[PDB]
Symmetry: D2
Subunit: 364 residues, 4 copies
């Protein structure tokens, strides 16, 4: 119970003879790697990611996406003017964590990003901006400040900026899980979008965004949410109500002065997509969350307010639009200077689906 | 495949001798009933309910509930001034069908109906009225025109009329299933209601009526919906959108010019309660639904508009607030003279949970 | 919390005037029954069945089934020489409890009981006998001492006695639930059986009775078990192992000296059929089970040994093949004089599927 | 639909100026990697693993494990004398595929491999040998020819060879998925095993290996199977019965002359463990399976017989104990010269749980 790989006796250390050396040479030849030279690495005491905790500043992400907007045309080959946050610990891979791409995308005036689909699951989130529609399976979906937009695996999507002003948002994808696991399919669709109309709300939303109500034409459950946009007005209202209910002495908040919602698939009550969990948190000025260790990785974008994240004991101060990653099992807490709003995503549905999830909370 | 109990050969007709008669006498003595005198009754070719299709007029229900309001005080023993629709086929039992109580309840000015709970699941529906709050687990829930209010099994509830004007609504309960199956528990609570406050919306609603959004404090699934009120404004809007989407050539409606929603438990996407399914239908003027045979029983209350129900070939004309029951397997269709809005409930969740459900639709 | 319908104040007792009497007369005319004259009956404090606890002796059931075998031919109309245990509390209905038919069936030498199917779910259990095959969907299934044979709803089945000696067994069916709920469908099949072959084991068994192993051709889950026979040798061995494990200090038994298995659907690990739960219990000589109150009804047939049942405080002594019923919520315990083996069935899957189940155990 | 990353127009190729070069330099500085230089790699048209199909010969694995048995002591540090098959395509990692460790382990006379546990899920399979017991949570489990032994995540286990003769078997683990995903926990237990007793069968088996029967003390579902050993005699019998049923014209086999079982968790009917699927196939002499493309990776060990595997068009001949891996989406078929028995495992439960699974079969 108390020993680690540092502290235990290495009892499988063979005599370094010419025959041993011949046996090891013969291993390499035959595509064999013995367990005993390697045990501690393959099976650590607790998760020890190669991904490192890290913070990206929004002013930095903005300046670089804007410069990218001058110098690089968006179109067919590369598909998107999207800049992926790359974990310094992940050997040059465009992965914010071992499971997830997190990135900034920029669409300049009147630009179109052509239609494609991929098994990989995706979502858009907007800290600031208006002007872009993303057309998901032919259904135009407005993008605005505070909106979560979904694009589940295997759905066609392309984006067009219907205005003379640029917008930026963030993408989250299971791109990295999907590459390492070999699950990727990809298909090119129309070079434009298939509908340039700009309805204020999409068809999915007009069918599925009535609370506690389900169309009779939609009685089959789905693996991904059929809600295309989760609009800021509902998220804001939910969070306010939880805070109001707290004031009124009623249970609601997840911890004192900590309001939070999880975005869900209305057909099951579960996660928006099989691999990706989205949440939105609002902390009262002064709130400090209890330190957590969680299996798998999570990313936050600050939506509004000022505060700090503490990861491994290290406080970093945070401003609007800043992003950070918390690798598997790294202890973390948030601290609200003002009322602190944040957008969150994680690979938790993968961890929970496979029974790998664990949670340590300080104070219990 | 073609034979019925009329047409088949009775090959188990014993010789009527004194010994046979002695054997049958000996059966009665020993609490034995032979199968062979009775097979066709116990196992019909298709469902053949003792419940009969029937229509109750709202003007009749109103007049009688109003007279009940003059002559009978509401309070402790009988619990509610509630008049239960009794199927003429069900031998004097207060059952609209073998599974369900359907009834009108009337609360006069400033009256209180004291708090109780029961394993039996319940809901309220309001064709017309305002003024009553029903307090569910201490949480006051406004009742208004078009609102579905829930009261799942084992939750405390009592009603108070906060106005100088009477209101009527309808109750649905699994009272009859529950009596015949022996599942009933009952408990007396406070003689008043435990909160006389009249918020415009309840705590459940302020936590759970944000579309696609789930509090993090409510991540456990429930057997019954935690939404206390499903308010007319959302039901009306959903139904309008489905009709609009139909006009725009988009899939949405359940059949042409037939819009419909099912009321659901947001934690699972399934039925409001284990035994009871609620739905709301809006038909375009002129729409006639395809004839259906369904296992189990269903009740509709006309909410708005004029039309007809056909049950067993028999058309009955329907007006606002009228109720009807369709027993198991009785063929039925609705016909809309004007735009025809109806509230619906059924025992279908019982049938589906136990794999007894079947559905015959004319044209397929 | 402490008041019952005896103890509470009747506050809805209207003044007995000619107008009140006219209002009540007008109720009967309009198929209306008021709640207030009836509340305590519809909603008892705890379940209060019309079914009564009762014991049927096997010597009595045997003598009557044997006499039935002389006087009544088995064949087409009545379908089966089956004698149903009728609860004295259930008004002349052939119901052992509100949900379940329990009955003895007798097939004389070389008799055939023709093929039929019905939505109603069924099983056979054999305390003593050999000689009968029951052909389920064309698949001959041997019947022997200690065997549970299944016949889920909508499967064809007919029985033939391949010997010059009579056999008796018991049937359990959701016949009574199904009649009162209107779920019954019925269909006549072949007048003989469709296969007279007498394999020692059936096709279902040769595919599905290998522990922890599932054919790749059978990867879809089923609502009912595809195992046609649960043979005594496995049931006996399981129960022995649990007793052995208990001796060895290992967890296994359900309570001290109480071994028990539940018969299951290998495709889900759940109940054999949607409405019916089957179990088999073996108690050590001297064991007395803790008193239980359970929602819904249960029937036991003594398989081997001597003991007693206590129901409502009343001990009745039990011998091999005797049957008893325990109505919903009646307190019950078993007492083993010798090693006491019993077969059990219940409507518990109905109660649990609809969240009506409750359980009170003395000592917790 | 027809274009790939070779064939499409690269429209995001910026002008190679000093400012562009400065922008790219500034990306590296800020831990940013643009999508457009990389799109085709991250999102291939269909899965394109770095893992390569490959075959390891059993005579080679045996000779090297035997030599390892002379030169390397087994004990505390390295934990196991286990040789992991390393995919030539996976950059020096001890991974047979991106998700799975597949390896040979050798325990010499009277050796003990000390107790540990790890979140990572494991199983043992034995083509040949007897003499070893693996003690899982204190419960000794015999290992013999043809046996699948389970060791789900977080269960203590250590192995001891109770004989004067060496045994080898194979291990499968989600070691590689678990390393890349950061889910690993590890704990050292006793230096010996906690029980040296050698029962012919384990406690798990004596409780859970009765077909269609479930202890009442084990009514909670488990995430992993509680069956510790799936013994060759049941696997052999199942496969024989399927072949017999085929001869008798009865459905059973998965394809003509192709018999197959999946090893399952009896509590759910699903996979043995969350990440790992085990199966066993028996092909008639002459059988050739239809070419399949499946998402995720699979490993087979030949158990008995002679035949061939075809992967990417390439036939390799196979003998007893040989192993091969089929990476995600590589087309594969087996060809039986004699009756061909094989053991199989895969990451399919991961793929299916996350909705990534796809299947192409030649002829449909
Ligand atoms: O469609 C989009 O907006 C989008 C954005 C970012 C992406 C990053 C990696 C892989 C695919 C992406 C993708 O398809
Ligand atoms: O609480 C209520 O409003 C109510 C209304 C009608 C009822 C009819 C039968 C049994 C219980 C009822 C009940 O509890
Ligand atoms: O098929 C059988 O053996 C059988 C036995 C008893 C039955 C009692 C009531 C209704 C149907 C039955 C039935 O179909
Ligand atoms: O316990 C065992 O037998 C065993 C065998 C092989 C293993 C390969 C990689 C990681 C852990 C292993 C492990 O725990």
């Amino acid at each position: 119970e108390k020993l680690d790989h540092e502290s235990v006796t290495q009892a499988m250390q063979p005599k370094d003879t010419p025959e041993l050396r011949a046996l090891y040479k013969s291993f390499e030849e035959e595509s064999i790697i013995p367990l005993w030279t390697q045990l501690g690495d393959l099976m650590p005491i607790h998760p020890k990611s190669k991904a490192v905790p890290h913070v990206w500043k929004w002013s930095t992400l903005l300046r670089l996406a804007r410069k990218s907007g001058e110098l690089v045309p968006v179109g067919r080959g590369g598909e998107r003017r999207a800049l992926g946050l790359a974990n310094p610990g992940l050997g040059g891979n465009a992965y914010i964590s071992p499971t997830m791409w997190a990135g900034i995308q920029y669409l300049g005036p009147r630009e179109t990003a052509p239609e494609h689909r991929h098994s990989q699951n995706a979502f858009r989130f907007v800290v600031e901006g208006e002007g872009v529609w993303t057309v998901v399976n032919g259904d135009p979906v407005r993008m605005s400040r505070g909106d979560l937009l979904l694009t589940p695996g295997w759905c066609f999507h392309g984006h067009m900026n219907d205005t003379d002003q640029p917008m930026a948002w963030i993408d989250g994808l299971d791109i990295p899980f999907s590459q390492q696991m070999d699950v990727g399919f990809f298909e090119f669709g129309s070079d434009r979008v298939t509908d340039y109309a700009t309805p204020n709300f999409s068809r999915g939303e007009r069918l599925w965004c009535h609370p506690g109500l389900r169309p009779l034409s939609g009685l089959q459950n789905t693996v991904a949410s059929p809600i295309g946009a989760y609009r800021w007005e509902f998220t804001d209202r939910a969070l306010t109500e939880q805070l109001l209910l707290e004031d009124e002495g009623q249970p609601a908040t997840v911890a004192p002065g900590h309001a939070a919602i999880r975005y869900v698939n209305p057909t099951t009550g579960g996660d928006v997509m099989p691999t990706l969990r989205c949440e939105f948190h609002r902390l009262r000025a002064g709130t400090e969350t209890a330190t957590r260790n969680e299996v798998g990785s999570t990313v936050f974008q600050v939506f509004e307010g000022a505060g700090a994240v503490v990861m491994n004991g290290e406080t970093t101060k945070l401003e609007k639009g800043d992003m950070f990653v918390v690798p598997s099992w790294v202890p973390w807490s948030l601290q609200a200077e003002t009322q602190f709003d944040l957008f969150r995503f994680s690979d938790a549905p993968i961890m929970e689906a496979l029974s790998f999830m664990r949670t340590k909370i300080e104070g219990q």
